[PDB]
Amino acid sequence: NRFVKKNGQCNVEFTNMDMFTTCVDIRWRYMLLLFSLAFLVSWLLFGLIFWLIALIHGDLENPGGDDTFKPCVLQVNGFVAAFLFSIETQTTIGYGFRCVTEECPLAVFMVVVQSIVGCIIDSFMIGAIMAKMARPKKRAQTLLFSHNAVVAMRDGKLCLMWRVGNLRKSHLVEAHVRAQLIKPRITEEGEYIPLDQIDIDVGFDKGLDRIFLVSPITILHEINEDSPLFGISRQDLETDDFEIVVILEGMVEATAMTTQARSSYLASEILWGHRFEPVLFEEKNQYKVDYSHFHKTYEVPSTPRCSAKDLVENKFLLSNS
Amino acid sequence: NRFVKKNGQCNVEFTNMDMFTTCVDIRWRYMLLLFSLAFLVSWLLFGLIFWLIALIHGDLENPGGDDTFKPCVLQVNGFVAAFLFSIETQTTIGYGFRCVTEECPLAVFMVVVQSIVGCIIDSFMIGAIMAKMARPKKRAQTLLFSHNAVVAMRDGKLCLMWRVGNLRKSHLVEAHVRAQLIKPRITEEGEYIPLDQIDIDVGFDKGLDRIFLVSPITILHEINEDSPLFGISRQDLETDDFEIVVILEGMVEATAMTTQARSSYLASEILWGHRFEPVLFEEKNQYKVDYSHFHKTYEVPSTPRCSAKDLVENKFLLSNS
Amino acid sequence: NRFVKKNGQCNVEFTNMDMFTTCVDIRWRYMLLLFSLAFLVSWLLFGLIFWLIALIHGDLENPGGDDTFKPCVLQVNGFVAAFLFSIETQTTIGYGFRCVTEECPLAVFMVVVQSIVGCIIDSFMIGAIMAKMARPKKRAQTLLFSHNAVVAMRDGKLCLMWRVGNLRKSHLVEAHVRAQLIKPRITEEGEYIPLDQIDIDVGFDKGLDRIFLVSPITILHEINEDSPLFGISRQDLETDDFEIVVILEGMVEATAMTTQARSSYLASEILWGHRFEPVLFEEKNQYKVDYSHFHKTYEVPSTPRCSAKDLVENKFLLSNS
Amino acid sequence: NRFVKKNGQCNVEFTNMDMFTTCVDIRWRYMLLLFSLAFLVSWLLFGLIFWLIALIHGDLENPGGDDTFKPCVLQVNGFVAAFLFSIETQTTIGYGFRCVTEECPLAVFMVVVQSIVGCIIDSFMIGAIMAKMARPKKRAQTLLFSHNAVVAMRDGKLCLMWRVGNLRKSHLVEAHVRAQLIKPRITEEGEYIPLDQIDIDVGFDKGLDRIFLVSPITILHEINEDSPLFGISRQDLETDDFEIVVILEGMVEATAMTTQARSSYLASEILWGHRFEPVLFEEKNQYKVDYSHFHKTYEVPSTPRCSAKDLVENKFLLSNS
Ligand SMILES: [K+]
Ligand SMILES: [K+]
Ligand SMILES: [K+]
Ligand SMILES: [K+]
Ligand SMILES: [K+]
């Protein structure tokens, strides 16, 4: 039946899976203690001002006032009371026992000031809990490479292969693969490149490196005249110092945040003359993917042990003679 | 007249269209009951603390106080009153009947604590109603494929074709098409690929797969020597087990979120020797698109019933002899 | 001197320039009247509830209460008072004259409910003023095409050219150009394509269509054997029904929102045998761009009046004989 | 050992490194004084209204009221008191001394109005402190070009080279390089291009311009028949007026904001017959990058002083004879 329903939906089911710009990430909870401190500082500061004012105006000795005398702020009898009024103003709780009066302009202006300050402050609190909210780090890896890469024969050509798959049913828009052989080398003129990155060809020029990934795919590198692996046999493989890097880029269907997935195979991690265990099965009305067979491989004794280079050379001696 | 006005505007009119990172999507309204619970828990907790304090300080028996005795918080006569003061503090309603006094530091500190807690809490409430606000799922599909794909003759070549169109007047920046024949196969060496994805060529190498989509377009795949459809005739079509996938990627003009539109044609869903009904008409000063003709097709009896492979083979026998 | 400073900075100066997902864009100010309505509805509803409660409990006739009788909410003497208490609760103004008491659980629960409701409501208000805040429409066009396109001779080849430029000093990351001849045509087999889009080659295959745009650039299309313009002379130009579309895509340096800039030239809008007036001048220590010369052009009488096709044909008759 | 751990992690360590849409960026702190003004204006306006009402209703002479007379708003004895009530309403502090009463509908409606206004206002305040919060300018440059570019011999070919490196351990998804020779020139037909941008080939056609950048890389431009540098020797280099631009695009792993890094080399800034000092060293279990050697270079006297053009020409005279 259908691999892709007419609406784009996929027919597969997955089984058996195991300046201050730095302030956005500024801290885990240290920002919370930071803001709690921000408040405390502002509350204590304005309380001291209100207490200074009540002290000077002489309210401390007549906090409630009377017919002849009106406090700047009612009911401030000390610094503790002062502290309270400041809080109630900024928090805008405003119980009202401590209350401003029309007497002192300085006091009124001070409330006016404290109100704006207070607003700005928690306004920023929402911004910091915005930044730190969505600006992640450590996004779960949705993509997977076979633990090993395989060298075997497919359709007459000798090929290095490895597997990639999505752990999520979510699609990868504009996905493409790359590979490089990495190793030190010395140029013809005797120049030293400590680690050289040599492209390994997955089909870029025809755009076959463009992939549609639903179920796990085996990526093919034909080893040929233009391959850095052209002169390598199965024995060389248990010798050589080279390492292969593999990449899969693309964009998460939901985010449109381009992703780059990486992994590596040492010469020692490449299994010659093997093949991957099929991960995809058809059961009646729909397709299943058994993810336990992902890394699993099996020997193909009929696989030639020599290098692709000698493989091709031999062909012509069986031609010429 | 003009297809594209000098300012970029398009001249067409459309007619007849029918960790906790998972918390962003955490729920529909279960988050609302979650937060309502968050509040309730904090309100009840602080009320119990205030009630514990009023109990110990002995306020329950003299809630209003007198000349010789001052409560930590005025007017707490029970747990219900206690509950109320907690609410009024956090909500910052602060009716003021239940009111803090300068007596108990513990109480003052508790208010101080409850104020910061309360702020943080709803600060987060705005973040959750941020995440859940714009982080969508199920974005309406703006793109469309003809229900069927057609095989006919164009400009001398035999071609598999299918239609794509935008349901919205909104443009697709950097849009491109891809296609693959999907089917099981067994390699020369006898290896089984359960479902193989073979590229179908829409013109990638010349970059003709890059498209400017205003009105609906017919996508052409020339069936030639290098096509997987090269050896297929009209009769094979009512036999074969293959399925074709089609893709259109690009980015919504507004969002710049790369989109990937999918659809499929079974061999059985491919109509041989047909053509699409034109969707675009010119009326005087501007262009119309009649979207009722989108999926509509018609027979072209002059269309050859054989495979493109034999089509080409025959040419040379009418050459040689 | 330098076009690009060693830090990447550019040395040019510019002169003489003239479900409810739809709710994000839901309205201009109709959303503001919407929310104002949202509040009003909630305020009136809860006030009616509080008034219902005060009515039943018999508070209307003893609003202040006394030694033997305690109202659910103090000082509710009517619906107007009721309305007020509801407001003061939700707004959390809480003057305190109308005040809740520990008597009626129903009332307490109602306050509890109204508090959460109120919070959720304006929480959403911040989300709507978030969506409608940054989710724009009508982004100012930063990119510009010469009003006309020119056909002239450059470096021995006959070429259709047109100009593009940035109105902003801001760079375009990964910018590239495309062009298409648009016109109706009838296929060899007699099929009608109402408007056909034919690629015009700006150098894609070598990736010369990739451009670095600081000062305005002239885009070149070599008219050759593979060009749809190959058979066109200056006289044909004052006849033909074809139109040319031009595109420039890329991403705004700041936004990384891919942009697609469009414009068109009718055959009648193409000026044959002309050239563009240079927009870029060097003055001593830095480069200026005079944007008044952008669309300006001048005749080049030495320009051949014939089609590039006959231009090439003639070459060989002056070869053969 | 490993360059890339099996999970994608990199094995290198770095050492020795030194309408109103314009309102988003509208100002540094001028927006803060703007909003503070926004509040003040609204507070003063509503206070004047409340004062107008209290004046007309005759409350000024009986602010507290009595058995026979009820003020619209209690305790407004002047404009200063009026100012206060307005503040306490909007801020929702609501001390309660100045308090609304059920008498004047006009007043009630006014409170109702002031409440919604107040909410909208600071709602917007959160949006402006949203825009101005994350919409940056001046993002730190994470990418680096060698101060100079080198011409030397590698693997038999004469090549212009320059270095690029990431200052951050953060990866660049889909990174690619470009280069252009920039200089004035006059066309065959005698047309003047003030500054011409000529592509310099870094391997685009094979997609070798696609790079995987962990440690700093040397970018190679083979100087050959198709190079604008083909006819240039070491002596020409101390003469010529040309400048070379270099670009590196790609997307920051975290942001997915495409970045374009630029830099330039004047003919005078190109060091002929040199090579770069290796920046990468292997110490036991892991790789180090010494960033002090980045710009450092050394002479290679064996480097030919002539132009690649004559280099190749000479080859055939040592062939022919
Ligand atoms: K209050
Ligand atoms: K309040
Ligand atoms: K109050
Ligand atoms: K190519
Ligand atoms: K409040």
Task: Please give the Cα distance from C162 to C148 (Å, whole number).
Answer: 7
- Give the amino acid at C184: P
Look at the block and give the residue holding tokens 């990384």.
Answer: C256
Question: B89 — contact with chain A (CB < 8 Å)?
Answer: yes
Q: Which stretches within chain B are classed as H helix? A: 30-57, 79-90, 105-131, 234-237, 308-320
Token digits of residue A317 = 């001696």
Task: Name residue D127's amino acid.
Answer: G
Tokens of C28: 């201009």
Is C170 in contact with C254 (CB distance < 8 Å)? Answer: yes
Q: A77 at the D interface (CB within 8 A)?
A: no
Contacts of B288 (CB under 8 A, 6+ apart): B12, B13, B15, B280, B281, B282
Query: Per the structure block, which two tokens stand in for A283?
Result: 């059961």
For residues B267 and B241, the answer to whether their CB atoms sit within 8 Å is yes
D16/C254 Cα distance (integer angstroms):
30
Binding-site sequence positions of B: 27, 29, 92-95, 132, 137
The token duo for D267 is 């003919």
Residue length, chain D?
321
Q: Which residues, including other chains, have CB under 8 Å from residue A182's CB and lie 6 or more apart?
A: A195, A196, A197, A198, A242, A243, A244, A245, D3, D4
C96 touches chain A (CB under 8 A): yes
Whether the CB of D127 is below 8 Å from some CB of chain C: the reply is yes
What is the CA(C84)–ligand 2 centre distance, in A?
A: 14
DSSP letter (8 states) at residue B20:
G
Report in angstroms the alpha-carbon separations of C187 from A309, B127, B202, B317: 49, 58, 19, 26
| Best CA proximity match to C241, nearest among C197, C194, C183 | C183
- Nearest to B95, CA basis, from C255, C184, C89, A318: C89
Backbone angles phi, psi at B187, to 5 degrees: -65, 160
- What radius of gyration do chain D's Cα atoms show? 36
- If we measure between CA atoms, which residue out of D244, D248, D298 comes closest to residue D270? D244
Note the resolution in Å, 1 decimal.
3.3
CA nearest to A287, candidates A2, A7, A12, A26? A12
Q: In chain A, which among 239-298 make CB contacts under 8 A with chain B? A: 251, 253-254, 256, 275, 278, 280-282, 287
User: Are A49 and A55 within 8 A, CB to CB?
Assistant: no
**Residue B81: CA count within 13 A, CB half-sphere:** 20
| Contact with chain A for residue B21, Cβ under 8 A | yes
| Closest by Cα among C71, C93, C82 to C49 | C82
A185 within 8 A of A198, measured Cβ to Cβ: no
Q: Are strands C280-283 and C286-290 parallel, antiparallel or unpaired?
A: antiparallel
Nearest residue in chain A measured CA to CA from C205: A205
Distance C94 CA to ligand 5 centre (A): 7
> What is residue A71's three-state secondary structure?
coil
DSSP 3-state of D151: strand
If residue D45 lies in a helix (H) or strand (E), which one and from where to where? helix D30-57
**Residue D131 to residues A135, A177, B113, C26, C222: CA-CA distances in angstroms?**
15, 37, 31, 20, 46
In whole angstroms, give the CA distance from residue C217 to residue C294.
Answer: 10
Helix, strand, coil % over all residues of chain B, rounded to 5: 30, 30, 40
Residues C165 and C294: their CA atoms lie apart, in Å, by 9
Report the Cα–Cα distance between both ends of chain C, in Å, rounded.
Answer: 51
- What 3 state SS string does chain C have? CCCECCCCCECEEEECCCCHHHHCCCCCCHHHHHHHHHHHHHHHHHHHHHHHHHHHHCHHHCCCCECCECCCEECCCCHHHHHHHHHHHHCCCCCCCCEECCCCHHHHHHHHHHHHHHHHHHHHHHHHHHHCCCCCCCCCCCEEECCCEEEEEECCEEEEEEEEEECCCCCEEEEEEEEEEEEEEECCCCCEEEEEEEEECCCHHHCCCEECCCCCEEEEEECCCCCCCCCCCHHHHCCCCCEEEEEEEEEECCCCCEEEEEEEEEHHHEEECEEECCCEEEECCEEEEECCCCCCEEECCCCCCCCHHHHHHHHHHHHHC
Method: X-ray
State the pairing for strand pair B73-74/B297-299: unpaired
Is A154 annotated in a binding site? The answer is: no
d(CA D211, CA C211): 19
Query: Cα separation of B90 and C257, whole Å?
Result: 42
- Among D96, D147, D256, select the one facing C97 at the smallest CB separation: D96
Q: Which residues of A touch C92 (CB under 8 A)?
A: 92
Half-sphere exposure for D235 (CA within 13 Å, toward CB): 2
Ligand 2 centroid distance, CA of B59 (Å): 24
D104 touches D53 (CB < 8 A): yes
| Residues 6+ away with beta carbon under 8 Å from B43 | B83, B86, B87, B90, C112
Query: Quick check: D205 and C207 CB within 8 A?
Result: yes
The values of phi and psi at residue D50, to 5°, are: -60, -35
- Measured CA distances, C135 to A136, B9, B255, B258, C132 (Å): 22, 21, 9, 17, 6
Cα–ligand 2 centroid distance for B86 (angstroms): 13
> Using CA atoms, how far apart are residues B79 and B98, in angstroms rounded to an integer?
12
Please report, to the nearest 10 degrees, the dihedral formed by the alpha carbons of residues B126, B127, B133, B136 taken in order: -170
DSSP state of D65: -
Q: Kindly state whether D126 is in contact with chain C, defined as any CB-CB distance less than 8 angstroms.
A: yes
Q: How far is CA C134 from the centre of its chain?
A: 12
Residues C185 and C198: beta-carbon distance below 8 Å: no
Q: From ligand 2's centre to the CA of A58, what distance in Å?
A: 28
Give the closest-approach CA distance of A188 to chain B in angstroms. Answer: 35
Residues, Cβ < 5 Å to ion ligand 1:
A 94; B 94; C 94; D 94
CA distance C51 to C58: 10
Structure tokens at D68: 């026979």
- Alpha-carbon gap, residue D164 to D211, rounded angstroms: 11
Name the residue of chain D whose CA is nearest to C91's CA. Answer: D92
- Residue D154 is inside which H or E element, if any? strand D149-154
Q: Are B178 and B296 in contact (CB under 8 A)?
A: no
Residue C226, amino acid: D
Beta carbons of B112 and A87 less than 8 Å apart:
yes
| Burial class of residue C84 in the structure, from the number of CB atoms within 10 Å of its CB (0-12 exposed, 13-18 middle, 19+ buried) | buried
* 8 Å CB contact of A131 and D136: no
Distance CA B264, CA B245 (A): 5
| Cα-to-chain-centroid distance, residue A310 | 45
- Reading the block at residue C162, the tokens are 């047109």
Ion ligand 5: protein residues whose beta carbon lies under 5 Å: A 92; B 92; C 92; D 92
Judge whether A94 is closer than 8 Å to chain C, CB to CB: yes
Please tell me what DSSP assigns to residue D20: G
Helices A30-57 and A105-131: crossing angle in degrees, nearest 10, is 180
Neighbours of B200 (CB within 10 A): 19
Among D267, D250, D255, smallest CA distance to D210 is for D250
Nearest chain C residue to B256, by CA: C257
Determine contact: A92 vs chain C, CB below 8 A: yes
| Alpha carbon distance B216, D154 (integer Å) | 52
Angle at A130 between CA A127 and CA A136, to 5 degrees: 140
Tell me the domains of chain C and their CATH numbers: 1-18+135-321 (2.60.40.1400), 19-134 (1.10.287.70)
DSSP code, position A173:
E
What's the full length of chain C, in residues? 321
H-helix or E-strand containing D36? Answer: helix D30-57
Q: In 3D, which of D179, D248, D177, D229 has the Cα closest to residue D208?
A: D177
Position A61, amino acid = E
Contact at 8 Å (CB) between C255 and C236?
Answer: no
Q: Is there a contact between C77 and C60 (Cβ–Cβ < 8 Å)?
A: yes
CA atoms of C73 and A270, how far apart (whole Å): 79
Q: How far is CA D31 from CA A110, A120, C283, D24, in A?
A: 21, 11, 39, 10
Angle between helix B105-131 and A30-57 (nearest 10): 130
D69: left (phi over 0), alpha (psi -120 to 50) or beta: beta
For B182-244, give the secondary structure using H, E and C.
Answer: EEEEECCCCCEEEEEEEEECCCHHHCCCEECCCCCEEEEEECCCCCCCCCCCHHHHCCCCCEE
The whole-angstrom separation of Cα A265 and Cα C195 is 52
Q: Is B105 on the interface with D (CB under 8 A)?
A: no
Residue C291 assigned ligand-binding role:
no
Q: Name the amino acid, one letter, at A59.
A: D
**Are A220 and A159 a contacting pair, CB within 8 Å?**
yes
- DSSP strand pairing (B157-166 vs B149-154): antiparallel
Give A95's contacts in chain C (Cβ within 8 Å): 96
Terminal alpha carbon distance of chain D: 51
A92 annotated binding-site participant? yes
CB-CB neighbors (< 8 A) of C134 in chain D: 24, 130-131
A203 interfaces chain B, CB cutoff of 8 Å: no
D202: left (phi over 0), alpha (psi -120 to 50) or beta: alpha
In this complex, the residue of A93, A207, A275 whose CB is nearest that of residue B94 is: A93
Residue B269 DSSP class? G
A278: nearest Cα among B240, B243, B185 = B185
In this structure, what DSSP letter does residue A262 have?
E
Q: Report whether C170 contacts C189 (CB < 8 A).
A: no
Between CA B181 and CA C228 the distance in angstroms is: 32
For residue A234, give the 3-state DSSP assignment: helix
Against chain C, the chains showing at least 3 CB pairs within 8 Å are A, B, D
User: From CA D203, how far away is CA D206, in angstroms rounded?
Assistant: 6
Size of chain A, expressed as the number of residues it contains: 321
Q: What is the least distance, in Å, from the CA of C195 to any CA of chain D?
A: 33
And the tokens for B196?
Answer: 């193989």
Interacting residues of A226 by C-beta distance below 8 A, sequence separation 6+: A201
DSSP per residue over D187-251, as a string?
A: -TTS-EEEEEEEEE-SSGGGTTTEE--SS-EEEEEE--TT-TTTT--HHHHTT---EEEEEEEEE
Query: Helix B105-131 vs helix A79-90: angle between axes, to the nearest 10 degrees?
Result: 20
Q: What is the DSSP letter of A76?
A: -
Task: Tell me the nearest-neighbour CA distance from D236 into chain B, angstroms.
Answer: 38
How is residue C14 written in tokens?
């510019």
